[PDB]
Amino acid sequence: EVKLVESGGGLVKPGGSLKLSCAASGFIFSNYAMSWVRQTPEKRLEWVATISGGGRNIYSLDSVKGRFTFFRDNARNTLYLQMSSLRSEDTAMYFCSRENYGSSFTYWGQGTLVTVSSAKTTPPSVYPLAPGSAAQTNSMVTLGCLVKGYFPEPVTVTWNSGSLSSGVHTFPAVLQSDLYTLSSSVTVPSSTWPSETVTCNVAHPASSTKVDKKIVPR
Amino acid sequence: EVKLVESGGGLVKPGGSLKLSCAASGFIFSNYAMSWVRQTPEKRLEWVATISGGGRNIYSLDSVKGRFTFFRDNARNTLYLQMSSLRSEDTAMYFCSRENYGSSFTYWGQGTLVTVSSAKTTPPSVYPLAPGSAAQTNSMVTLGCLVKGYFPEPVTVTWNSGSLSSGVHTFPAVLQSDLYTLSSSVTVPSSTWPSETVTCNVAHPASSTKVDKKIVPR
Amino acid sequence: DVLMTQTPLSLPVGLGDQASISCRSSQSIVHSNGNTYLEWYLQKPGQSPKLLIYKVSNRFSGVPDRFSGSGSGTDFTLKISRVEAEDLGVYYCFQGSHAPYTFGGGTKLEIKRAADAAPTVSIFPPSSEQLTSGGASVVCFLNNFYPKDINVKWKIDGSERQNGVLNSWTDQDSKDSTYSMSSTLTLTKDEYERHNSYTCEATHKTSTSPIVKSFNRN
Amino acid sequence: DVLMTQTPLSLPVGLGDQASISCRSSQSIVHSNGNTYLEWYLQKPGQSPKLLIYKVSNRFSGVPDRFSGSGSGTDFTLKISRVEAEDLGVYYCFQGSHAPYTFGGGTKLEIKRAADAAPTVSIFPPSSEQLTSGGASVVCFLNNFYPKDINVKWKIDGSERQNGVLNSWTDQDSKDSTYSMSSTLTLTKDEYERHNSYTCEATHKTSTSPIVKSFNRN
Amino acid sequence: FDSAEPWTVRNED
Amino acid sequence: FDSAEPWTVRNED
Ligand SMILES: [Cl-]
Ligand SMILES: [Cl-]
Ligand SMILES: [Mg+2]
């Protein structure tokens, strides 16, 4: 019922600008103050600002004054975060959140990711992971995909277009020299591969990249 | 740790044959009895058989005797169900399950779907669902896609290759005259569409079909 | 054979309240070795069944102590103390004492949501793609409502349409306490083009006036 | 500004057992209206934070009674009377009394699994496609193990290699009390072809000798 | 007391 | 008692 959905996150160079939005539904928007809270790469939570129901009273971090501006459009059930003079320290997942009687952050959205960096947007290269040649007595076989050399986050990974979901481990991306690398493994019955195809589907919206990679025996 | 993965399910004609497999890992396979249990389209659970650790003692439903046979390969960590003379009453999700001290069905697999029917395999038509006339002040917009006229089950649906998950409702299929139809809705901020791309990804493994439909304004 | 009679068929409970589910065997289910292999299983939406309780009253490892089983003779009972949203699903009793082993018919546990919610209603015209193929489906989503009781009708140029309608339904899950449904009206293209206005009309406890969504073919 | 000091940083607890998480503010956090806006949040893996407790001791609606809050002045405690798998995640205290509002550093709740699990280890050679492009990544998955303590090394022709290694880690989730790990070794193609054997070697509590998986470039 | 404190319902009991 | 009952560990206490 109550729903909050943030948008507008993306990669920006230090010094740059970005406008974030937060769409609300399922309640009378202007009856409630709204907050921005961010989560840093180290996973610390940081309150950023709180703005009143009517939109004219605002508390905010001193370190964002003159850089971030907060306002709402009550006619359109939307909350805004206008960012400028962006810094590395502003890199974070940005959440919007609705107050309630007695509590500060009662309802949260799913967040939108802001990356402040000089590093260049780069699409991933996606490679299959298949076993060399060992234990063929195993009832299971583990396959995988390597999603290498992209920037910024995030990427999504699915297997057989979502048909395959149970035996999956997708690992968090690791950053090295301005590029991310990520892997995902899937385990299937050994009697079903290669007789039944296994494909990882990788998407990297920031570069408009989509790759489907079939896992083939060596 | 303990993992059980069934496979082999599919569409078969009445009177036909099908072999199911169940791969086990994470325990000493031959130390445990295994069962087959099936779930009917009416969602009722039905025990089918239990076979001993060593594979030479079997209990089974009288109504499958002379039709189904049960065996295991302990050197390959695999359990089998050989079906023959299949009936409509056999249409069900088949689960394999391992016993433990005190309990019959301690660990379950994901299931594999067996459909017994004369009806022909049929790929879906995928149609985009875009609004005709908005409400300009809505912070949210709802889109969808209609997945119509396929057989057999199942179908999976994702949105933007899994990037969108929070605002999705995917509905159970409805069977009309030997074809299934399903729909899925996604709700996104109105400021992000059509300015940004929304696509439903639809998979129908039985007909080896995989399709993407971009939702475009009318 | 032993018949297992489960009641109630469904059970709406508030969060924090108690649930009690009954199972009656048609005869004694004491195993030859003197134990009673009466078990309880829970199937959460979209998942395989999982073991909760074995030999009448024994909790399987990892099962919260909110779940308890009791009984003797032919009467057995599963109790959930202080129900949580994660408890949603269908509960099944099972006797493994006398072959053929049999399951009760199941009890669906539902949450009595603390607050009501009006559906979000969206109507969608046929896609040009479908119209090309000679068909015309009009789709209506009615999302995130509580309570469950809802009345949906299709009108074409003001007249109730009784033929060509298929409906689908999702129940609650641990993440979402509300219901949703989808309704599709399918006509021929010729039929579709002979009328002007298409209407999805919903009646729900949250208002004495119906929620009406329409579009004009134009 | 008010600092919030949260202890412990992580907390291993068996299912069904109790847990206390402590929070200390660097000064009084009584708001000017006389209330104390001390809140507790839980962030489950891959989800947004959610509200548990507000004004020191009040459970938000829908939150299980297993969670309780106490404290006064500068000293506060979250108690969980009995831990369930679904409780996995990072817990944060927060003060909303004095701007700038501030969060504690978090406490990661982890399940102390009743039984250990050896890692399933798999090693993967570079794909011919990556080689053609001039690179050579070697990947090792170490899946579904417990406890979390594990040593992983790469050997090339028997010599440990340190350079060009990236490691990624997943913690527990509600459906899984084990951990998994991925390691990727990247060389140039030419360097890859100067060596014969590539080895992923893991040391874990479950075995007295290292788990060794290898392939030969041959 | 701050007349410009942003909370609209939070501080109300 | 059935010597051919298939349960291998279930019936053991
Ligand atoms: Cl105001
Ligand atoms: Cl045997
Ligand atoms: Mg203390």
Coordinates of C-alpha atoms in Angstrom, one line a residue, chain B residues 31 33 50 52-53 57 59 99-104, chain F:
Chain B
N31 CA 22.6 -44.1 4.1
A33 CA 15.8 -43.8 2.1
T50 CA 9.7 -44.7 -0.8
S52 CA 15.4 -47.9 0.9
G53 CA 19.0 -46.7 1.1
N57 CA 13.0 -52.4 -0.7
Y59 CA 6.7 -49.2 -0.9
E99 CA 14.2 -39.2 5.2
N100 CA 15.9 -38.7 8.6
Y101 CA 15.6 -40.3 12.1
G102 CA 12.0 -39.7 13.2
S103 CA 10.7 -38.0 10.0
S104 CA 9.6 -39.1 6.5
Chain F
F1 CA 6.9 -55.6 11.5
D2 CA 7.8 -55.8 7.8
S3 CA 11.3 -56.9 6.9
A4 CA 10.8 -55.1 3.6
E5 CA 9.7 -51.7 5.0
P6 CA 11.8 -49.2 3.0
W7 CA 12.7 -46.6 5.7
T8 CA 16.4 -46.9 6.5
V9 CA 16.9 -44.5 9.4
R10 CA 13.4 -43.1 10.0
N11 CA 12.1 -45.8 12.3
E12 CA 15.3 -45.8 14.4
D13 CA 15.2 -44.0 17.7

